[PDB]
Each structure stands twice: as C-alpha cells, then as structure tokens.
Amino acid sequence: NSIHASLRQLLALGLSKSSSAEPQRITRTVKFKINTDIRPDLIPVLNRHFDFFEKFRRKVLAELEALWNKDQKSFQAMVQCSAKKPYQKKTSCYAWLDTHFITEAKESLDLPRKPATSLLYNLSGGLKSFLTRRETVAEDIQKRFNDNLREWNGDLSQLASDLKAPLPPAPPNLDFENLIEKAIEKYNDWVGRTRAWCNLILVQQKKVERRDACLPRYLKGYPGFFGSQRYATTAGLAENLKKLEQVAREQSKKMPTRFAKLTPEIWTAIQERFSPTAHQTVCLRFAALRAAHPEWTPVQLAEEILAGIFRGAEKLKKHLAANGFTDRPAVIKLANLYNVAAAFSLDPIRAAGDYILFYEEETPKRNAFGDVRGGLHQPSDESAAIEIMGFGLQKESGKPLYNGLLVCKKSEKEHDDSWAFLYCHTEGQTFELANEKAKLRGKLLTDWTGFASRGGSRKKAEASAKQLARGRVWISEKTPPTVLPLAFGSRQGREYLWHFDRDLREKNEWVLGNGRLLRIMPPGQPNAADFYLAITLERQVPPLADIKAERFIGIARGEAIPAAYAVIDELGKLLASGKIAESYRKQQREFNDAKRELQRTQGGYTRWLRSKERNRARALSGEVTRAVLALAAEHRAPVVLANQPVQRALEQKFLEAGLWEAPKRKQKFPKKDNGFIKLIDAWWTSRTCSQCGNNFRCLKCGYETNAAVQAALTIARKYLFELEHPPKKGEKDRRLKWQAWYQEKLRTV
DNA sequence: GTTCACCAGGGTGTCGCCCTCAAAATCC
DNA sequence: GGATTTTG
RNA sequence: GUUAGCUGUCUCUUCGGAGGCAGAUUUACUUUGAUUCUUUGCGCCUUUACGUCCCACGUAUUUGACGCAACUCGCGAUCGCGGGGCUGGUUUCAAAGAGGGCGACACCCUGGUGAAC
C-alpha cells in the first residue's frame, strides 16, 4: 500500500522484463543536516567562510554588472564563448572568469582558490540562464510593443478622434536591437500613464463605456542581472520610521502657509474630506474642535490638530524606543499617525486641484510610509550555498581532486555507525585514501571509510567510467580538514546510505555526484544559523519495459477534490472508483484566510504560515502518488492523466521502477504515454454524460453524480478512443467522432 | 459602498533557466 | 609534494 | 513512534499460504494528516472600543511589546551557555521528501489620488 511497497511491487515486473535498452540514470539528493547542536564550534567557522564567499561574490558581481552595463555584446561574447568562438583566447565562460578573477587578480583573494573557483563555476551557469531568458523574453516584449503601436494608430486614436477626447502623449521607443532595461522602464511608465487616462476618460465616463478602451499592454518579463534583487539593501524598520518622521514634520512645517490663504470653497472642501483609525480619529477631533471653537480661523485648527497628532507620535515612538520595534500594533499606529499628519498638512494643495504639485509633494511621504509598512512584514530568510565540485581522485593516487569527502566510521556494533563530512578550506588541510598498511609521510590514519569517485570524465577521449571508490582515510597531521557531523533520519539512511540493495559500503549502485554546503539564516542575525549538506547521488534504474496492459487507471484533477480515480479494464467497464484528499481545498482555504487576516490585523504572519501552503502541496502530491501507485500496482495498470508536482512525482516514481523514460535531450515535448504514464487532451471529458454521453447533473437524461469521479472515468474510457482513431496535426476538433465512438461502445456494451 | 485605473511598499507560490568533474601540465 | 592553472 | 522486503509465535486449519500479535528494520533531517491531556504569571508601556476632544486621567477583563521569575527542553561543567510557551507543548497513531542558484510572473495585505456606479 505504501509508495515504497507498491514501488517494489512494480519493480517485481519492471526489472522482471527482457529489454535491450540501456539503463537510465536518476539524480537524487540526500540533504543531510550539519549537527551544529552537538558541535557548535563550527558555527563561527562556517559563518566566516560563507562571509568570505559572499564578499567575493558581491565583488565579482560588481565588476560583472559594470561590464554588462558598459557594453552588452562583449558580455554576451564572454558568457557564450565556445572552442569555436573563443573570447580572449578562452573557450568557456568559466575559464575566462577563472583567469580574470584569480590568475590575473591583483590583491590576494580572502577566499581559498577551490571555493572561489566553484563560485565562478556556479556563476557561469547563472549568467548563461540570464542571457537565455533575455533571448526568450525579447520576442514576446517586441510582440507587445508592436501590438501597442498598431493599437495607437487606428483603434485608440480613431476612438478618441471620433469621440472628441484629446489624445494623451505618444509611446516612447525601445531600441530593440541592443535591448536595455531603462528603455523598457520608460515605455512601461508611459503604458501606465495612458492606461490610467483610458479608464477614466472612456470606461469610467465622458466616453463610450467599452471595457477594452484599447488599454495598451505592459512589456513584461525582462530579467534582472544576477543578484540585482538578491543584494538590494533595505533599511531597518527604525530607519524607515525616522525617514517617515522627518518627512511628515517637513510637510507640517509648511502647513500654516497653506492654511493662511484658504478660500471659503476650499475650506468647505477640506471640511468635507474630514467629515465623519488615524484618519477617522483625526476627523472626530476635527468635528470636536469645529463645534467647540466656531470663533477660530482654519489655521489655528490645523495647527492644534497637527500638534495633537505629533504628540501622539511622541508617545508612540517613546514606547517604541523603550520597548523595541517588535510591538507591531504600536508601529502600525505610529506609521498611520505620520501618514495622517502629512495627509492633513498637504490637504489644501489636493483640495485646490493642483494634483501635479500634490503628487511631487507627497512622493517623500509616499515612499517613506511604503517603506515602513513593507518592513512591518517579516523578511524572507537568507540562503547561501557553497559547492564541492567533485569527489574524484588523482589517478593512481587516491589523492583528492577537490576539498570534500563523505566519511563513515563503521563500528563493530550493528546499530552504531557514524557519518560525517570532511571539508578543506584553510591552508594545509589534506586528506587521502590509502590502505592501512600503505604508510604515508606527514599523514595520520583514521577509522573513517571515505567515498570518493574514479572516472566519469566528460572529455570524449578522457571519458573513463565513473566508479564508487572507497578506502581508508589519511588526514594531514599539522592541519587536518574540518569535520561536519551529520543528522539525517532512518528513512533517509535506509534509502541512500544502507539500502538493502545499494549499501554504500558493500554495493556499487550509487555514485557520488557533488556536494553543497548550505546556510539558512534570518537576515541580520548569523548566530542562529542552520547548516545543511546536500550530496547528489546517481544510479542506474531498470531499462523501460514493453507492457501489454489489460487494465488502465484514469485520474482527473483541478476541482475541490485534487484527484479522483476510476479503475477500468481493457474493455472500459468500471472496476472501482474513489477520491483522494477531499479536505485539501478546504484546509488550504482556511490557511489562506488566516494569512489574509494576519496581514490585515498586524501586517504579516510570523512563524509557519509562511511555508505551510507549500508543505501542504508537497503532502498532497505524496498522497495522490501513493493512491495512484497502489491502484496501478494492484491492477498492473498504466495511469491516464490530462494534459504539475503530482505529474512529476508520478513519472519519477514510474521511471525509478523502469516503467517511464526520463526526458531525452532536446525533445521538449513529452511522449503522451511512456510506460504507465499516459497523457490525453482534457477535451470533451468532464462534459459528456456518463450514462449517455453529451456535482454533475446531465440534461439529456437527468443523471446526477460526482463531477470528479465521472470525469476520471471518462478520461480512462477516452484513452481507449484514440486507439482506433489516431489524431493528426492541424486537426483538433473531433467531437462528432468521439461521441459516435462513445455511443457505439455504449450500445455494444 | 463597491469597481476600475494609476502610484508606493512588502509577503508568498509557481515557473524559467540554470547546474549536480575529471584530469593534465606547470610552478614554488 | 603540494599548489596553481587551464580545459573539455 | 511508524510510513523495509525480517524474525518469533497464535490461529485460520486438511487446500493454497493467510490474517492477528510481538519485537526488527543503524540517526536523531525537512514536512503532511488525524488524535489524548494541558491555556505560565507579576510588573512597565502600548493597541481596538466608551466617555472627552488630543496629551492626560478613568474604565473593558480589548490587541500586543519589553523586563523578572515558574516551567519545559538542548548544551557543557551545584552552576553556566542557548531555545519555546497556543501559529504551542504533549500522548497515541498513519503517511511523504532531489536539491541548489538567480530571476520573472501571479496573487494577497496596507496606504494614496481620481473617477464611475
């Protein structure tokens, strides 16, 4: 019944086949945890190493961004240089970066060369992704640009001229051949201005109320350079509050000048704006002071009101300073007090109709209040990653190529072995794999058994096979490497470390790919940091089969019920049905509502609502895959779906058993059926009546049943339809045939 | 009192676009 | 010998 | 705690091997869902309501934040170093996980201007 149980039961007929195909690989991560609870002295060391890593990353990104902004063709040449098209005698992006930032470095890097080199290796892939994304985005952005231009010549212009409304300014130009960020932002600013014009001028009123109104489209999706968002600094809450304070005071020091020149009409409008929490309470005091003192000029009332507002701000901020900026009710009220003070001070300009000056007067207050209100939310956690590039050894040596080894201290007891990680970053830290009797100079022998690699070279001529190399570990005497104790949980070690069929110490099924140090931190506090170790392992899984199924399973998704199933035979008559996780949508809605009310009442959600939804999505994928796999194993049946995490988990599980083929290179389209997984178009499926073929209620017969279950049964019974009537490219409408086949089957059986 | 447009700030969830070393020669 | 460097 | 395919037993019974119980199943990670019992409290300030009209002064048994101690845990040697106290801890359970980087988009919350209805 378990995913493992049905997976093994499916292996019992996945590796029980006879196929001439090559075995396929699967890449998986173990994701240990660095035991910083029992070994806390590693916290400052790991933090300092990650700090040097981040300093070097920021420095390199500064130069790379200056180079991208200087000119962009040279940057494109550097990032995409190949042996055919080298850049400065370099054949890859990472080679160029290695000489420029390490070999040709002037000042000694504070990072050791291997971590710095791995950083540049990761950064090369980051840059390549950024350039590929620009390449894909630019086409759609040009499409939007042309759409706007052709709308602004014969549709919006014609509408405005035929309805007497003057045409606002024209669109700017994007310079498409060397597309740059600032031109896009200029164009988007114009787009926003004119979309505001169109709704008010036409859809709101004074023109024909056509919802469209030719509102021009935004140009969307242009990528940020690497790190632009990652390393964009934002001030603390206290500093934003100080900025808001000074802005509000500066707006309230110009108030008497604006109130001394009030016409009766403007004064009446100002009274209307504040005619009956910070806004409302100030309105209430406004009414109180109007009624109690009718013998006062508006200047005196505004002066007293703002004095009161700022006295409240005085007490609020005194409380904040004496009790920290974590009393978010106080912060909300203080922010609101400055906001309302500024609004009332700037009211005469707004009421006079000088909105052009009003906006540019409000801009400091607008930005400061936005900053404070945003900082009220808890910032996203900071995550960093340092890679160990490989585990191979120097040929004929047992000497590492890189600075990290997974080690295991096998005990003499059955349930007391230990695992750790050796990491070299400091100078003089060396480990080696040699047998106990093969003595070495300047090294100590240890009880660790180490897992290294041998072979796997990517060079055609140099490409020897990869193999798990293990042996006894010698460490440097003077300066030994750093030990990272591990904590992982039996379900994991049972899976990757000592599996019945693939124990690391006795079998040769897994091969170490690489490693990654990880740090997860709450921004602004490193002393409480979470450190993980991610090791990527690879193994062969059985070759894909050639199954002859007489059972099939249909599944429908996208409703209150995440997944509903309906087992069928080869003829198509139902054998079972049900639904999976029928409470998921309700629980998800409850969590969403809790998040929204937390956002309102206090600004944000402090602890686990942040990741809950995503966790529930993962749990839902697990449950759905379990149910489907158990049914398929029960009936030896391929599953049928409709044309994302659930789909991915299902195909991963089926390929690990040898019943699905992972993506080929290129081949971006997937095969509709690959072993058990079948894919069909969700067309004419959830509408056709089960009892006839046209909560769900039929109109041609009056049948009523569950929409999800009938949809699943229809999907399962529709896979059979294309068996005799294969589809063709260019043709998509097959409702007639489909209905004819369905009714013919219903009549026959 | 709700709807729309626009402006400012922040959060999250999903997707795009990225990867998951070895091995040889030279230098200090 | 260990480290640097380049490269596919 | 479990989400390993083991082992030892009791019955089913002869039929096929097939149901229950006990322990296995190395680590202690990141999660999900049920389920049992349990609301730390003493000051100083602040929030949303009522009066009062803001500062202030009262009063709900109103939202919270700091400090001190009760507890719970980890930690190292009676004491010190750290974490949590309802978005909790705790008992029984029954079930998942391949990770990292950098961006973009979608939605949500608040504020602001204008207009339409």
Side-chain angles (χ1 to χ4, degrees), chain A residues 240-283:
Chain A
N240 289 318
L241 266 181
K242 297 295 291 297
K243 301 301 187 32
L244 168 74
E245 161 171 354
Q246 70 174 348
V247 165
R249 290 290 167 113
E250 291 172 355
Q251 272 298 345
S252 313
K253 287 190 191 91
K254 317 155 71 173
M255 163 269 302
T257 294
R258 315 206 188 96
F259 266 94
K261 45 187 64 57
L262 279 191
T263 72
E265 202 275 336
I266 287 171
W267 177 232
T268 313
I270 290 185
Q271 290 190 161
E272 282 190 335
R273 175 62 66 184
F274 287 77
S275 62
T277 76
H279 177 81
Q280 282 171 359
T281 185
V282 166
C283 287

Side-chain angles (χ1 to χ4, degrees), chain A residues 58 155 306 359 450 453 456 461 463 471 500 516 520 553 565 570 703 716:
Chain A
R58 287 168 157 279
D155 310 323
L306 277 155
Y359 184 84
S453 290
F500 284 154
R516 278 189 200 277
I520 297 89
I553 283 161
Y565 64 83
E570 74 276 45
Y703 188 46

Side-chain angles (χ1 to χ4, degrees), chain A residues 507-731:
Chain A
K507 306 283 186 286
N508 278 287
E509 297 296 314
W510 292 107
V511 291
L512 297 167
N514 64 7
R516 278 189 200 277
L517 261 57
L518 307 171
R519 180 180 61 175
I520 297 89
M521 183 191 294
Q525 49 121 304
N527 209 2
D530 265 2
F531 295 103
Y532 292 97
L533 172 71
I535 284 150
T536 290
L537 285 160
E538 297 101 7
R539 73 176 180 94
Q540 319 289 155
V541 301
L544 178 62
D546 189 6
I547 62 170
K548 280 73 176 175
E550 66 258 51
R551 307 280 179 82
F552 305 86
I553 283 161
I555 173 165
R557 300 169 289 149
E559 196 167 0
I561 300 168
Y565 64 83
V567 191
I568 60 166
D569 74 332
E570 74 276 45
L571 279 77
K573 65 93 175 179
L574 186 77
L575 315 170
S577 168
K579 58 193 175 189
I580 311 153
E582 70 278 356
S583 282
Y584 169 78
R585 205 273 308 275
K586 175 262 290 178
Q587 291 160 336
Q588 159 200 353
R589 272 187 193 171
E590 291 187 347
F591 285 117
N592 281 323
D593 308 340
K595 264 155 61 187
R596 292 177 67 186
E597 69 89 12
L598 277 164
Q599 271 177 301
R600 276 189 181 87
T601 194
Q602 70 181 8
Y605 32 99
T606 58
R607 2 232 218 284
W608 57 260
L609 264 81
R610 294 174 85 224
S611 42
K612 167 56 81 176
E613 174 172 342
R614 274 195 290 92
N615 303 349
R616 292 195 320 270
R618 293 187 304 182
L620 170 78
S621 72
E623 289 133 15
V624 175
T625 303
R626 160 168 200 214
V628 170
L629 278 188
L631 295 173
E634 274 181 83
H635 311 85
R636 285 83 176 289
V639 181
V640 188
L641 280 75
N643 296 115
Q644 214 72 27
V646 182
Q647 173 82 44
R648 290 192 297 257
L650 212 61
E651 57 203 13
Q652 281 306 287
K653 279 298 157 210
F654 273 122
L655 62 84
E656 155 167 357
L659 297 156
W660 192 81
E661 172 56 57
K664 300 289 94 176
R665 56 152 298 278
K666 180 67 174 66
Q667 305 298 326
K668 64 182 181 293
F669 85 99
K671 308 181 314 181
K672 297 175 67 54
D673 51 347
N674 187 340
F676 281 53
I677 305 290
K678 302 191 176 299
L679 295 174
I680 61 175
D681 49 347
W683 286 59
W684 309 290
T685 59
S686 196
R687 298 285 187 263
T688 58
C689 176
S690 309
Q691 286 314 307
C692 135
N694 180 52
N695 205 279
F696 166 85
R697 173 187 173 177
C698 180
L699 62 83
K700 274 177 75 75
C701 319
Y703 188 46
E704 190 160 5
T705 176
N706 215 333
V709 163
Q710 64 94 33
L713 188 153
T714 316
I715 282 176
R717 280 202 76 150
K718 188 213 179 68
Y719 161 67
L720 278 296
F721 163 69
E722 63 261 20
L723 189 151
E724 301 162 356
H725 319 293
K728 283 95 189 169
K729 182 62 66 68
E731 200 263 353

Side-chain angles (χ1 to χ4, degrees), chain A residues 356-535:
Chain A
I356 303 283
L357 189 89
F358 175 71
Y359 184 84
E360 64 96 20
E361 286 291 341
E362 292 281 334
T363 316
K365 188 261 275 182
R366 168 160 56 251
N367 270 313
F369 180 82
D371 279 347
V372 181
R373 193 70 174 149
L376 264 169
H377 297 212
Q378 189 62 32
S380 164
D381 274 20
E382 270 186 333
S383 289
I386 290 170
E387 181 187 341
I388 295 91
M389 281 163 107
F391 295 117
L393 302 167
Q394 281 153 246
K395 284 163 126 157
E396 316 306 323
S397 198
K399 274 171 198 167
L401 303 164
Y402 293 107
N403 56 1
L405 201 73
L406 175 73
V407 287
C408 169
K409 197 169 289 187
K410 310 174 230 171
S411 277
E412 69 277 19
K413 307 184 187 64
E414 62 273 11
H415 82 86
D416 268 319
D417 75 359
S418 184
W419 304 65
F421 200 76
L422 299 172
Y423 191 60
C424 302
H425 44 296
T426 310
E427 197 259 327
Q429 284 185 324
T430 79
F431 64 81
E432 189 177 347
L433 290 194
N435 66 65
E436 56 198 0
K437 47 190 64 170
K439 58 188 68 58
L440 305 180
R441 182 211 199 191
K443 307 234 174 194
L444 268 71
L445 181 68
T446 68
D447 278 320
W448 304 108
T449 294
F451 309 86
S453 290
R454 276 216 186 267
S457 167
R458 77 185 62 165
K459 298 187 216 258
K460 182 67 181 294
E462 294 199 358
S464 66
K466 182 64 70 177
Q467 65 183 357
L468 178 49
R470 51 187 90 92
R472 292 294 300 289
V473 176
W474 300 74
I475 68 172
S476 179
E477 176 176 69
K478 164 190 72 91
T479 316
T482 291
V483 178
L484 317 172
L486 294 183
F488 44 99
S490 278
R491 179 166 182 87
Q492 302 188 352
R494 183 182 289 181
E495 184 163 11
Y496 298 101
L497 283 59
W498 59 75
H499 189 258
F500 284 154
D501 303 329
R502 318 152 196 147
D503 196 344
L504 286 194
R505 291 147 293 173
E506 294 93 5
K507 306 283 186 286
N508 278 287
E509 297 296 314
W510 292 107
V511 291
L512 297 167
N514 64 7
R516 278 189 200 277
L517 261 57
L518 307 171
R519 180 180 61 175
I520 297 89
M521 183 191 294
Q525 49 121 304
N527 209 2
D530 265 2
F531 295 103
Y532 292 97
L533 172 71
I535 284 150

